[PDB]
């Protein structure tokens, strides 16, 4: 039982009004069962795809979840992760500078 590490970020440097891709990269976790949602203003985005499960040398898993999006001055985006190692779902806000 290893807890997931989370990074929320865009594929391309973000510009308000310009189409892009929102990524949630979860890594370092075990077992593989995980719930990952991308949120727009607290609501779950529906057309979210993900990578095929793979793992690192210490056997921990990683997954990329992603969807198209368009950053704006006004919308907030986030990733929400739940795992047996977490008491409650962890939300990490997208910050275009990270």
């Amino acid at each position: 039982q290893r807890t997931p590490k989370i990074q929320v970020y865009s594929r391309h440097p973000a510009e308000n009004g310009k189409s892009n891709f929102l990524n949630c990269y979860v890594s370092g976790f075990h077992p593989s069962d995980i719930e990952v949602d991308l949120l727009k203003n607290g609501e779950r985005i529906e057309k979210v795809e993900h990578s095929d499960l793979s793992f690192s040398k210490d056997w921990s898993f990683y997954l990329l979840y992603y969807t198209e999006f368009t950053p704006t001055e006004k919308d907030e985006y986030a990733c929400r992760v739940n795992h047996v190692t977490l008491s409650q779902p962890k939300i990490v806000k997208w910050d275009r500078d990270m």
């Binding site: 970020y9 890594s27 075990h30 077992p31 593989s32 793992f55 056997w59 992603y66």
Partner: protein, 275 residues
């Protein structure tokens, strides 16, 4: 430079209902080129890179046959290990397997590997001689004696030094346009004032391939350790990778600080400084 071919297998038991979930992915270097998911509709080994789709129906029938057999091997193993460890049928457990081969910049065999894990811990692995086994615990020595009897390390060493490197070498030429192309990192530096006397300098490396990269911060030409943050390399989602390193500096002192970027796509390492 050097190159590798690797296969990753994960199988997760479903005590509530049905057979295990099975996911297999194949890589050349950092490029995923095949996949199989037991919950997908095709029930076939599927292409994931344009240069493997050239392969004919003999290839896809054989790879599908093999990966479906490996799924069943992991299924049996999940049951066997449940007994070895005296665990109930009520819990979910995981088997993971990874194997592959590395070639040097002359495309000649460098090393092979084959590793097995139960519930996320080392179970059994082939040593680098490709002749001996490392068993982590006593359940694993039961497996080790069984595999000594069945000539397993023999067959693995033949594949890893032979078939494996041969097909890696075939893929490298069929996929030359991407597999032998290096994407050097696109680098830039950003500035984020955190007060009127302090700021974060962030050094970015974007859209690079392969994933291996070194980002390091220097202050007055010497390694800067304090107040740095370095994130794990992460996929862009388009086949390339990203990474950044940041340091907190006193405002007005930004010029003492240099970020240094090493990557196989750069003939000499790169040096960035905030203006």
């Amino acid at each position: 430079g050097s190159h590798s071919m690797r296969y990753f297998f994960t199988s997760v038991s479903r005590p509530g209902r049905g057979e295990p979930r099975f996911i297999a992915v194949g890589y050349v270097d950092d490029t995923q080129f095949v996949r199989f998911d037991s919950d997908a509709a095709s029930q076939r080994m599927e292409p994931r890179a344009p240069w493997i789709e050239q392969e004919g129906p003999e290839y896809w029938d054989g790879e599908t046959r093999k990966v479906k057999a490996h799924s069943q091997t992991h299924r049996v193993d999940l049951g066997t290990l449940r007994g070895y460890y005296n665990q109930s049928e009520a819990g979910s457990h995981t088997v993971q397997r990874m194997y592959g081969c590395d070639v040097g910049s002359d495309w000649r065999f460098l090393r092979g590997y084959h590793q097995y894990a139960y519930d996320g811990k080392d179970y059994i692995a082939l040593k680098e001689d490709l002749r001996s086994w490392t068993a982590a615990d006593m359940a694993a020595q039961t497996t080790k004696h069984k595999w000594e009897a069945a000539h397993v390390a023999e067959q693995l060493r033949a594949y890893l030094e032979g078939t494996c490197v041969e097909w890696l070498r075939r893929y490298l030429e069929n996929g030359k346009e991407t597999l032998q192309r290096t994407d050097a990192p696109k680098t830039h530096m950003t500035h984020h004032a955190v007060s009127d006397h302090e700021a974060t300098l962030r050094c970015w490396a974007l859209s690079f391939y392969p994933a291996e990269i070194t980002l390091t911060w220097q202050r007055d030409g010497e390694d800067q350790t304090q107040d740095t943050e370095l994130v794990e390399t992460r996929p862009a989602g388009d086949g390339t990778f990203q990474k950044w390193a940041a340091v907190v500096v006193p405002s007005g002192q930004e010029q003492r600080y240099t970020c240094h970027v090493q990557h196989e796509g750069l003939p000499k390492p790169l040096t960035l400084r905030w203006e």
